[PDB]
Amino acid sequence: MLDKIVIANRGEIALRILRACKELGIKTVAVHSSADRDLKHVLLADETVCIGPAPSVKSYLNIPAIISAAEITGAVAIHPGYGFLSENANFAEQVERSGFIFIGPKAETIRLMGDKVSAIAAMKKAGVPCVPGSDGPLGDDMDKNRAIAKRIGYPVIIKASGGGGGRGMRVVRGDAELAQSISMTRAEAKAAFSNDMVYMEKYLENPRHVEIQVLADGQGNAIYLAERDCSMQRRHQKVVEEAPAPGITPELRRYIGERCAKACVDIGYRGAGTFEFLFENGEFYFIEMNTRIQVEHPVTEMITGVDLIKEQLRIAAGQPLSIKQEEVHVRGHAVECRINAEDPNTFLPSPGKITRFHAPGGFGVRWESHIYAGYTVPPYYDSMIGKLICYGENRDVAIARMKNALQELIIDGIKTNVDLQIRIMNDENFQHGGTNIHYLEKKLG
Ligand SMILES: COc1cccc(OC)c1-c1cc2cnc(N)nc2nc1N
C-alpha cells in the first residue's frame, strides 16, 4: 500500500479519507490552515503540518506549501479530496513531476474533462449520448451562430468551455437575444477562467440531474456503479442526493453505464469519476465529467457495498479493482441530506460555535461529519458541515429513516438547514420521486 499520504483537504472529506487510510494501514499527514488546527481529522492524523493562514489561497490552494509538506514528512501520495485543487491539472502535473502520486487520473485527463468542448467531443466519439449542440466553439460570426441555433432549435444555452456548475451560462429563447448573450458569456468566461471560449447546446427545460459513478484501474478494468439523482438543488448547489435514481430501470442503467465504462477505456481514464447527465423524456444527455470523488459518493457506497475512497487508494498503488462489473449489484436505496451552516432566510453562510451536538444513530444511518460539541465553524470555507446518509431496503424506508435521523440531530449554537431538510423529506412530490432540477426553487417560492 501507499506508506503515507497527504490529505490535501479539510472537514468531512478529510475525515472520510483519513478513515479509509487507517483501515488500509496508510499513515496520514493532515495539512491544515491556522484556522483548522482543531479539525477532527487533524486531531486523529499521525502527522500534522500547518501550511498557512486561514484564507484558502495561502493554505488549501497553496500548491508549493502542500508539496513541501509531502516532501518534509516523506509522504508518497496526495489525496486532493473534492472542491479545491482536485480538478487542477497543473497541480496534479506538478505533484507527478515532484515525484509524488496524485490520487486521481493523469493530468492530461483532468484538463480534457476540464475543457467542456473537448470533453463532449471525446464522449460523442466514444458513443456517449450528448446534448444536441454546436459540436465545437462558437466564433464571432453571428450568421453562423444564428444558423447553429436554428438547426438546434430554440431555446438554446450558451456555455463556457472553462465553466462548470452554474458558471457561466445563459439561456437564449430567440434570435434577438443571441448576439448579446454570446458576448456576455464570453466576457464573463474571460474574466473568470481566462478562457473566452463558448459553446451552444439545446436548452433542456425540465430535466433531472442523473450522474454515473465510475471506477477505473491501471490494468484495463473500468466499471460503472449505478447512478445518482441530484435534482434537489438550489442555484447549482445540491441539497439532497439519492441512489439509485427513481424510475431508472435495470436496462436503462446498464445501457448508459456500459457506455460510460467504454468511454473510460477509450480515453484511458484512471481512478474514480462521475459522468453527469441531464435526464429528460427517458433520454440521457451528457453535459460534463467530474474527475474526482464527489460530495455525494456515500449513497453509491450504500447501495453497492463498494468503498470508493479505499478503491482510489488501491488504484493509486497499482492494485486492480477489487470488484468485477458482474459482481456489482444495486441493493436497496440511500438518500443523502447535506447539512449546511446557513441562514434559513438569506441562504448565506452562518459560521460560529457549536454549543451542543448530537449525532443520530441506528440501522442504516450514516453520519459523515467532522463537527463536535464546542467546535467552531470558520467563516473562510464552504457552509457544508456534514452529511446525513440513510439507507433502506427500499426508497420509502430510506426516507423514513432520514426523517427519524434528522429529528435526532442536534446542532445548537449555529443556524442550519436541518428544518428545511425535514420539510423536503415530508414533501409529497419528493415522496413520490422523480422531481426535476427546478422543483426546490419553486417550492421555496
Ligand atoms: C445540473 O443542471 C442544472 C442545475 C441547475 C440549473 C441548471 O440550469 C438552469 C442546470 C442545467 C440545465 C441545463 C439544461 N439544458 C442544457 N443543455 N444544459 C443544462 N445544464 C445545466 N447545468
mmCIF file with all atom_site columns, C-alpha atoms in Angstrom, residues 158-331:
data_model
loop_
_atom_site.group_PDB
_atom_site.id
_atom_site.type_symbol
_atom_site.label_atom_id
_atom_site.label_alt_id
_atom_site.label_comp_id
_atom_site.label_asym_id
_atom_site.label_entity_id
_atom_site.label_seq_id
_atom_site.pdbx_PDB_ins_code
_atom_site.Cartn_x
_atom_site.Cartn_y
_atom_site.Cartn_z
_atom_site.occupancy
_atom_site.B_iso_or_equiv
_atom_site.pdbx_formal_charge
_atom_site.auth_seq_id
_atom_site.auth_comp_id
_atom_site.auth_asym_id
_atom_site.auth_atom_id
_atom_site.pdbx_PDB_model_num
ATOM 1   C CA . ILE A 1 158 ? -24.565 29.307 -24.188 1.00 0.00 ? 158 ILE A CA 1
ATOM 2   C CA . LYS A 1 159 ? -21.880 27.718 -22.026 1.00 0.00 ? 159 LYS A CA 1
ATOM 3   C CA . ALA A 1 160 ? -18.294 28.481 -21.068 1.00 0.00 ? 160 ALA A CA 1
ATOM 4   C CA . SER A 1 161 ? -15.818 25.766 -22.050 1.00 0.00 ? 161 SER A CA 1
ATOM 5   C CA . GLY A 1 162 ? -13.768 26.557 -18.927 1.00 0.00 ? 162 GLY A CA 1
ATOM 6   C CA . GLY A 1 163 ? -17.021 26.695 -16.964 1.00 0.00 ? 163 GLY A CA 1
ATOM 7   C CA . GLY A 1 164 ? -18.800 24.201 -14.726 1.00 0.00 ? 164 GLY A CA 1
ATOM 8   C CA . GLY A 1 165 ? -21.802 24.046 -12.406 1.00 0.00 ? 165 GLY A CA 1
ATOM 9   C CA . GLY A 1 166 ? -23.677 27.303 -12.947 1.00 0.00 ? 166 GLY A CA 1
ATOM 10  C CA . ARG A 1 167 ? -20.667 29.160 -14.265 1.00 0.00 ? 167 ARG A CA 1
ATOM 11  C CA . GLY A 1 168 ? -21.047 30.555 -16.786 1.00 0.00 ? 168 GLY A CA 1
ATOM 12  C CA . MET A 1 169 ? -24.178 30.211 -18.881 1.00 0.00 ? 169 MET A CA 1
ATOM 13  C CA . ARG A 1 170 ? -27.295 31.856 -20.242 1.00 0.00 ? 170 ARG A CA 1
ATOM 14  C CA . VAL A 1 171 ? -30.487 30.690 -21.926 1.00 0.00 ? 171 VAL A CA 1
ATOM 15  C CA . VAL A 1 172 ? -31.397 32.274 -25.262 1.00 0.00 ? 172 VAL A CA 1
ATOM 16  C CA . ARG A 1 173 ? -35.032 31.940 -26.318 1.00 0.00 ? 173 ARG A CA 1
ATOM 17  C CA . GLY A 1 174 ? -34.871 33.801 -29.660 1.00 0.00 ? 174 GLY A CA 1
ATOM 18  C CA . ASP A 1 175 ? -32.584 35.300 -32.330 1.00 0.00 ? 175 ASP A CA 1
ATOM 19  C CA . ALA A 1 176 ? -32.970 38.782 -30.800 1.00 0.00 ? 176 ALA A CA 1
ATOM 20  C CA . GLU A 1 177 ? -31.044 37.813 -27.627 1.00 0.00 ? 177 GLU A CA 1
ATOM 21  C CA . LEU A 1 178 ? -28.364 35.561 -29.166 1.00 0.00 ? 178 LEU A CA 1
ATOM 22  C CA . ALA A 1 179 ? -25.560 38.011 -30.070 1.00 0.00 ? 179 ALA A CA 1
ATOM 23  C CA . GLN A 1 180 ? -25.657 39.805 -26.708 1.00 0.00 ? 180 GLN A CA 1
ATOM 24  C CA . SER A 1 181 ? -25.840 36.517 -24.775 1.00 0.00 ? 181 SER A CA 1
ATOM 25  C CA . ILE A 1 182 ? -22.769 35.075 -26.523 1.00 0.00 ? 182 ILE A CA 1
ATOM 26  C CA . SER A 1 183 ? -20.881 38.333 -25.898 1.00 0.00 ? 183 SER A CA 1
ATOM 27  C CA . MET A 1 184 ? -21.862 38.361 -22.211 1.00 0.00 ? 184 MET A CA 1
ATOM 28  C CA . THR A 1 185 ? -20.975 34.696 -21.615 1.00 0.00 ? 185 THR A CA 1
ATOM 29  C CA . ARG A 1 186 ? -17.623 35.267 -23.389 1.00 0.00 ? 186 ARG A CA 1
ATOM 30  C CA . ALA A 1 187 ? -16.805 38.331 -21.270 1.00 0.00 ? 187 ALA A CA 1
ATOM 31  C CA . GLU A 1 188 ? -17.675 36.528 -18.025 1.00 0.00 ? 188 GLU A CA 1
ATOM 32  C CA . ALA A 1 189 ? -15.654 33.459 -19.076 1.00 0.00 ? 189 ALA A CA 1
ATOM 33  C CA . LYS A 1 190 ? -12.626 35.593 -19.994 1.00 0.00 ? 190 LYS A CA 1
ATOM 34  C CA . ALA A 1 191 ? -12.798 37.326 -16.589 1.00 0.00 ? 191 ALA A CA 1
ATOM 35  C CA . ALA A 1 192 ? -13.374 34.125 -14.596 1.00 0.00 ? 192 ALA A CA 1
ATOM 36  C CA . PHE A 1 193 ? -11.395 31.411 -16.425 1.00 0.00 ? 193 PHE A CA 1
ATOM 37  C CA . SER A 1 194 ? -9.041  33.435 -18.664 1.00 0.00 ? 194 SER A CA 1
ATOM 38  C CA . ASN A 1 195 ? -10.719 31.361 -21.393 1.00 0.00 ? 195 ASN A CA 1
ATOM 39  C CA . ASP A 1 196 ? -13.322 33.143 -23.517 1.00 0.00 ? 196 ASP A CA 1
ATOM 40  C CA . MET A 1 197 ? -14.296 30.003 -25.466 1.00 0.00 ? 197 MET A CA 1
ATOM 41  C CA . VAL A 1 198 ? -18.028 29.227 -25.519 1.00 0.00 ? 198 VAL A CA 1
ATOM 42  C CA . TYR A 1 199 ? -20.325 26.567 -26.982 1.00 0.00 ? 199 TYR A CA 1
ATOM 43  C CA . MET A 1 200 ? -24.027 26.109 -27.694 1.00 0.00 ? 200 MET A CA 1
ATOM 44  C CA . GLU A 1 201 ? -26.390 23.362 -26.543 1.00 0.00 ? 201 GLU A CA 1
ATOM 45  C CA . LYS A 1 202 ? -30.133 22.832 -26.916 1.00 0.00 ? 202 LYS A CA 1
ATOM 46  C CA . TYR A 1 203 ? -31.749 24.103 -23.705 1.00 0.00 ? 203 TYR A CA 1
ATOM 47  C CA . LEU A 1 204 ? -33.443 21.307 -21.769 1.00 0.00 ? 204 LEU A CA 1
ATOM 48  C CA . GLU A 1 205 ? -36.371 22.919 -19.997 1.00 0.00 ? 205 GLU A CA 1
ATOM 49  C CA . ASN A 1 206 ? -37.269 20.426 -17.240 1.00 0.00 ? 206 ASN A CA 1
ATOM 50  C CA . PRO A 1 207 ? -34.559 17.744 -16.869 1.00 0.00 ? 207 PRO A CA 1
ATOM 51  C CA . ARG A 1 208 ? -33.464 15.588 -13.944 1.00 0.00 ? 208 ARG A CA 1
ATOM 52  C CA . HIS A 1 209 ? -29.817 15.543 -12.861 1.00 0.00 ? 209 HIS A CA 1
ATOM 53  C CA . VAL A 1 210 ? -28.654 11.933 -13.057 1.00 0.00 ? 210 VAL A CA 1
ATOM 54  C CA . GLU A 1 211 ? -24.966 11.016 -12.801 1.00 0.00 ? 211 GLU A CA 1
ATOM 55  C CA . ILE A 1 212 ? -22.987 7.768  -13.234 1.00 0.00 ? 212 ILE A CA 1
ATOM 56  C CA . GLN A 1 213 ? -20.221 6.758  -10.819 1.00 0.00 ? 213 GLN A CA 1
ATOM 57  C CA . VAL A 1 214 ? -17.254 5.005  -12.435 1.00 0.00 ? 214 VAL A CA 1
ATOM 58  C CA . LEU A 1 215 ? -14.037 3.345  -11.260 1.00 0.00 ? 215 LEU A CA 1
ATOM 59  C CA . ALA A 1 216 ? -11.041 2.519  -13.438 1.00 0.00 ? 216 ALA A CA 1
ATOM 60  C CA . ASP A 1 217 ? -7.676  0.988  -12.518 1.00 0.00 ? 217 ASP A CA 1
ATOM 61  C CA . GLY A 1 218 ? -4.241  0.911  -14.191 1.00 0.00 ? 218 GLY A CA 1
ATOM 62  C CA . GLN A 1 219 ? -4.772  -2.579 -15.583 1.00 0.00 ? 219 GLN A CA 1
ATOM 63  C CA . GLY A 1 220 ? -7.587  -2.000 -18.084 1.00 0.00 ? 220 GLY A CA 1
ATOM 64  C CA . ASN A 1 221 ? -10.570 -2.514 -15.786 1.00 0.00 ? 221 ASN A CA 1
ATOM 65  C CA . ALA A 1 222 ? -13.348 0.072  -15.947 1.00 0.00 ? 222 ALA A CA 1
ATOM 66  C CA . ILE A 1 223 ? -16.666 -0.271 -14.122 1.00 0.00 ? 223 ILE A CA 1
ATOM 67  C CA . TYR A 1 224 ? -19.859 1.725  -13.565 1.00 0.00 ? 224 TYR A CA 1
ATOM 68  C CA . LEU A 1 225 ? -21.524 1.706  -10.131 1.00 0.00 ? 225 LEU A CA 1
ATOM 69  C CA . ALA A 1 226 ? -25.090 2.730  -10.995 1.00 0.00 ? 226 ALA A CA 1
ATOM 70  C CA . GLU A 1 227 ? -26.443 6.277  -10.883 1.00 0.00 ? 227 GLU A CA 1
ATOM 71  C CA . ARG A 1 228 ? -27.327 9.125  -8.503  1.00 0.00 ? 228 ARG A CA 1
ATOM 72  C CA . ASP A 1 229 ? -30.200 11.583 -8.779  1.00 0.00 ? 229 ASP A CA 1
ATOM 73  C CA . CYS A 1 230 ? -29.073 15.079 -7.725  1.00 0.00 ? 230 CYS A CA 1
ATOM 74  C CA . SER A 1 231 ? -32.065 17.200 -8.859  1.00 0.00 ? 231 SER A CA 1
ATOM 75  C CA . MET A 1 232 ? -32.901 18.550 -5.364  1.00 0.00 ? 232 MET A CA 1
ATOM 76  C CA . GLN A 1 233 ? -30.791 21.669 -5.728  1.00 0.00 ? 233 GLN A CA 1
ATOM 77  C CA . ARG A 1 234 ? -30.839 25.445 -5.389  1.00 0.00 ? 234 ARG A CA 1
ATOM 78  C CA . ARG A 1 235 ? -28.753 27.717 -7.658  1.00 0.00 ? 235 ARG A CA 1
ATOM 79  C CA . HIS A 1 236 ? -26.377 24.895 -8.708  1.00 0.00 ? 236 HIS A CA 1
ATOM 80  C CA . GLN A 1 237 ? -25.961 23.731 -5.098  1.00 0.00 ? 237 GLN A CA 1
ATOM 81  C CA . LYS A 1 238 ? -27.083 20.138 -4.482  1.00 0.00 ? 238 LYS A CA 1
ATOM 82  C CA . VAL A 1 239 ? -29.235 19.715 -1.382  1.00 0.00 ? 239 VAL A CA 1
ATOM 83  C CA . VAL A 1 240 ? -30.451 16.093 -1.477  1.00 0.00 ? 240 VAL A CA 1
ATOM 84  C CA . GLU A 1 241 ? -28.916 13.227 -3.457  1.00 0.00 ? 241 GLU A CA 1
ATOM 85  C CA . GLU A 1 242 ? -30.173 9.673  -3.800  1.00 0.00 ? 242 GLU A CA 1
ATOM 86  C CA . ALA A 1 243 ? -29.210 6.312  -5.258  1.00 0.00 ? 243 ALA A CA 1
ATOM 87  C CA . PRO A 1 244 ? -30.396 4.732  -7.391  1.00 0.00 ? 244 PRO A CA 1
ATOM 88  C CA . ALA A 1 245 ? -32.452 7.257  -9.402  1.00 0.00 ? 245 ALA A CA 1
ATOM 89  C CA . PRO A 1 246 ? -36.247 6.680  -9.201  1.00 0.00 ? 246 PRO A CA 1
ATOM 90  C CA . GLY A 1 247 ? -37.709 5.384  -12.482 1.00 0.00 ? 247 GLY A CA 1
ATOM 91  C CA . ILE A 1 248 ? -34.399 4.145  -13.881 1.00 0.00 ? 248 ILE A CA 1
ATOM 92  C CA . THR A 1 249 ? -34.851 0.519  -14.925 1.00 0.00 ? 249 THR A CA 1
ATOM 93  C CA . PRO A 1 250 ? -32.059 -2.088 -14.738 1.00 0.00 ? 250 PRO A CA 1
ATOM 94  C CA . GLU A 1 251 ? -31.937 -1.991 -18.573 1.00 0.00 ? 251 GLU A CA 1
ATOM 95  C CA . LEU A 1 252 ? -31.548 1.811  -18.747 1.00 0.00 ? 252 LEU A CA 1
ATOM 96  C CA . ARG A 1 253 ? -28.885 1.556  -16.035 1.00 0.00 ? 253 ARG A CA 1
ATOM 97  C CA . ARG A 1 254 ? -26.719 -0.897 -17.997 1.00 0.00 ? 254 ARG A CA 1
ATOM 98  C CA . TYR A 1 255 ? -27.304 0.942  -21.290 1.00 0.00 ? 255 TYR A CA 1
ATOM 99  C CA . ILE A 1 256 ? -25.847 4.246  -20.042 1.00 0.00 ? 256 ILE A CA 1
ATOM 100 C CA . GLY A 1 257 ? -23.484 2.518  -17.581 1.00 0.00 ? 257 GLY A CA 1
ATOM 101 C CA . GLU A 1 258 ? -21.783 0.351  -20.227 1.00 0.00 ? 258 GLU A CA 1
ATOM 102 C CA . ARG A 1 259 ? -21.368 3.447  -22.421 1.00 0.00 ? 259 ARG A CA 1
ATOM 103 C CA . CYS A 1 260 ? -19.604 5.303  -19.569 1.00 0.00 ? 260 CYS A CA 1
ATOM 104 C CA . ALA A 1 261 ? -17.312 2.294  -18.894 1.00 0.00 ? 261 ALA A CA 1
ATOM 105 C CA . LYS A 1 262 ? -16.342 2.132  -22.595 1.00 0.00 ? 262 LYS A CA 1
ATOM 106 C CA . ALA A 1 263 ? -15.586 5.876  -22.667 1.00 0.00 ? 263 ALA A CA 1
ATOM 107 C CA . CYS A 1 264 ? -13.162 5.335  -19.735 1.00 0.00 ? 264 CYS A CA 1
ATOM 108 C CA . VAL A 1 265 ? -11.280 2.668  -21.718 1.00 0.00 ? 265 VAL A CA 1
ATOM 109 C CA . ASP A 1 266 ? -11.230 4.848  -24.860 1.00 0.00 ? 266 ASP A CA 1
ATOM 110 C CA . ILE A 1 267 ? -9.713  7.828  -23.026 1.00 0.00 ? 267 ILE A CA 1
ATOM 111 C CA . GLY A 1 268 ? -7.551  5.749  -20.661 1.00 0.00 ? 268 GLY A CA 1
ATOM 112 C CA . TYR A 1 269 ? -9.259  7.050  -17.525 1.00 0.00 ? 269 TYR A CA 1
ATOM 113 C CA . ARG A 1 270 ? -7.806  6.235  -14.085 1.00 0.00 ? 270 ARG A CA 1
ATOM 114 C CA . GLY A 1 271 ? -9.488  6.391  -10.637 1.00 0.00 ? 271 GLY A CA 1
ATOM 115 C CA . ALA A 1 272 ? -12.987 7.348  -9.513  1.00 0.00 ? 272 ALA A CA 1
ATOM 116 C CA . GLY A 1 273 ? -15.018 9.626  -11.784 1.00 0.00 ? 273 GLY A CA 1
ATOM 117 C CA . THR A 1 274 ? -18.549 10.831 -12.453 1.00 0.00 ? 274 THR A CA 1
ATOM 118 C CA . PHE A 1 275 ? -20.416 11.233 -15.745 1.00 0.00 ? 275 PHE A CA 1
ATOM 119 C CA . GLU A 1 276 ? -23.020 13.995 -15.294 1.00 0.00 ? 276 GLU A CA 1
ATOM 120 C CA . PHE A 1 277 ? -26.177 13.698 -17.371 1.00 0.00 ? 277 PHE A CA 1
ATOM 121 C CA . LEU A 1 278 ? -29.394 15.541 -17.882 1.00 0.00 ? 278 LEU A CA 1
ATOM 122 C CA . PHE A 1 279 ? -32.237 13.058 -17.991 1.00 0.00 ? 279 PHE A CA 1
ATOM 123 C CA . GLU A 1 280 ? -35.460 14.092 -19.742 1.00 0.00 ? 280 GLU A CA 1
ATOM 124 C CA . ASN A 1 281 ? -38.216 12.187 -21.586 1.00 0.00 ? 281 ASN A CA 1
ATOM 125 C CA . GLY A 1 282 ? -36.438 8.905  -20.824 1.00 0.00 ? 282 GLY A CA 1
ATOM 126 C CA . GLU A 1 283 ? -33.267 10.100 -22.578 1.00 0.00 ? 283 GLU A CA 1
ATOM 127 C CA . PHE A 1 284 ? -29.727 10.673 -21.250 1.00 0.00 ? 284 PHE A CA 1
ATOM 128 C CA . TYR A 1 285 ? -27.635 13.651 -22.351 1.00 0.00 ? 285 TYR A CA 1
ATOM 129 C CA . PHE A 1 286 ? -24.030 14.079 -21.191 1.00 0.00 ? 286 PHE A CA 1
ATOM 130 C CA . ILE A 1 287 ? -23.070 17.571 -20.022 1.00 0.00 ? 287 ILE A CA 1
ATOM 131 C CA . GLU A 1 288 ? -19.765 17.179 -18.142 1.00 0.00 ? 288 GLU A CA 1
ATOM 132 C CA . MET A 1 289 ? -17.447 14.802 -16.297 1.00 0.00 ? 289 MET A CA 1
ATOM 133 C CA . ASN A 1 290 ? -16.017 15.242 -12.815 1.00 0.00 ? 290 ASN A CA 1
ATOM 134 C CA . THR A 1 291 ? -12.612 13.603 -12.479 1.00 0.00 ? 291 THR A CA 1
ATOM 135 C CA . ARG A 1 292 ? -12.587 13.266 -8.702  1.00 0.00 ? 292 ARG A CA 1
ATOM 136 C CA . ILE A 1 293 ? -14.530 11.789 -5.783  1.00 0.00 ? 293 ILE A CA 1
ATOM 137 C CA . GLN A 1 294 ? -17.721 13.764 -5.147  1.00 0.00 ? 294 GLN A CA 1
ATOM 138 C CA . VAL A 1 295 ? -19.542 15.049 -2.057  1.00 0.00 ? 295 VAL A CA 1
ATOM 139 C CA . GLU A 1 296 ? -22.439 12.666 -2.783  1.00 0.00 ? 296 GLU A CA 1
ATOM 140 C CA . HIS A 1 297 ? -20.332 9.489  -3.138  1.00 0.00 ? 297 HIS A CA 1
ATOM 141 C CA . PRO A 1 298 ? -21.706 7.833  0.076   1.00 0.00 ? 298 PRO A CA 1
ATOM 142 C CA . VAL A 1 299 ? -25.122 6.986  -1.495  1.00 0.00 ? 299 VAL A CA 1
ATOM 143 C CA . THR A 1 300 ? -23.379 4.899  -4.184  1.00 0.00 ? 300 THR A CA 1
ATOM 144 C CA . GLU A 1 301 ? -21.373 3.104  -1.462  1.00 0.00 ? 301 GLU A CA 1
ATOM 145 C CA . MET A 1 302 ? -24.551 2.226  0.484   1.00 0.00 ? 302 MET A CA 1
ATOM 146 C CA . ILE A 1 303 ? -26.255 0.570  -2.491  1.00 0.00 ? 303 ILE A CA 1
ATOM 147 C CA . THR A 1 304 ? -23.223 -1.285 -3.946  1.00 0.00 ? 304 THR A CA 1
ATOM 148 C CA . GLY A 1 305 ? -21.091 -2.045 -0.875  1.00 0.00 ? 305 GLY A CA 1
ATOM 149 C CA . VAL A 1 306 ? -18.025 -0.504 -2.534  1.00 0.00 ? 306 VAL A CA 1
ATOM 150 C CA . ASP A 1 307 ? -15.736 1.762  -0.541  1.00 0.00 ? 307 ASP A CA 1
ATOM 151 C CA . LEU A 1 308 ? -14.859 4.289  -3.232  1.00 0.00 ? 308 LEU A CA 1
ATOM 152 C CA . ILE A 1 309 ? -12.124 6.102  -1.266  1.00 0.00 ? 309 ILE A CA 1
ATOM 153 C CA . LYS A 1 310 ? -10.414 2.768  -0.497  1.00 0.00 ? 310 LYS A CA 1
ATOM 154 C CA . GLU A 1 311 ? -10.638 1.965  -4.226  1.00 0.00 ? 311 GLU A CA 1
ATOM 155 C CA . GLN A 1 312 ? -8.949  5.292  -5.046  1.00 0.00 ? 312 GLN A CA 1
ATOM 156 C CA . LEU A 1 313 ? -6.055  4.330  -2.762  1.00 0.00 ? 313 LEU A CA 1
ATOM 157 C CA . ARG A 1 314 ? -5.896  0.806  -4.212  1.00 0.00 ? 314 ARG A CA 1
ATOM 158 C CA . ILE A 1 315 ? -5.804  2.148  -7.794  1.00 0.00 ? 315 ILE A CA 1
ATOM 159 C CA . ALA A 1 316 ? -3.071  4.707  -6.970  1.00 0.00 ? 316 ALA A CA 1
ATOM 160 C CA . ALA A 1 317 ? -0.887  1.926  -5.512  1.00 0.00 ? 317 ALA A CA 1
ATOM 161 C CA . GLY A 1 318 ? -1.258  -0.205 -8.674  1.00 0.00 ? 318 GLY A CA 1
ATOM 162 C CA . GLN A 1 319 ? -3.784  -2.719 -7.354  1.00 0.00 ? 319 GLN A CA 1
ATOM 163 C CA . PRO A 1 320 ? -6.617  -3.772 -9.675  1.00 0.00 ? 320 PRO A CA 1
ATOM 164 C CA . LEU A 1 321 ? -10.300 -3.103 -8.928  1.00 0.00 ? 321 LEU A CA 1
ATOM 165 C CA . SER A 1 322 ? -11.372 -5.356 -6.048  1.00 0.00 ? 322 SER A CA 1
ATOM 166 C CA . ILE A 1 323 ? -14.752 -5.816 -7.810  1.00 0.00 ? 323 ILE A CA 1
ATOM 167 C CA . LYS A 1 324 ? -15.731 -7.118 -11.270 1.00 0.00 ? 324 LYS A CA 1
ATOM 168 C CA . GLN A 1 325 ? -18.636 -5.465 -13.152 1.00 0.00 ? 325 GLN A CA 1
ATOM 169 C CA . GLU A 1 326 ? -20.575 -8.759 -12.857 1.00 0.00 ? 326 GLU A CA 1
ATOM 170 C CA . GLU A 1 327 ? -20.163 -8.520 -9.065  1.00 0.00 ? 327 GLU A CA 1
ATOM 171 C CA . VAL A 1 328 ? -21.668 -5.016 -8.828  1.00 0.00 ? 328 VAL A CA 1
ATOM 172 C CA . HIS A 1 329 ? -25.299 -5.244 -7.733  1.00 0.00 ? 329 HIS A CA 1
ATOM 173 C CA . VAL A 1 330 ? -27.682 -2.442 -6.766  1.00 0.00 ? 330 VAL A CA 1
ATOM 174 C CA . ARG A 1 331 ? -29.352 -3.316 -3.463  1.00 0.00 ? 331 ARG A CA 1
#
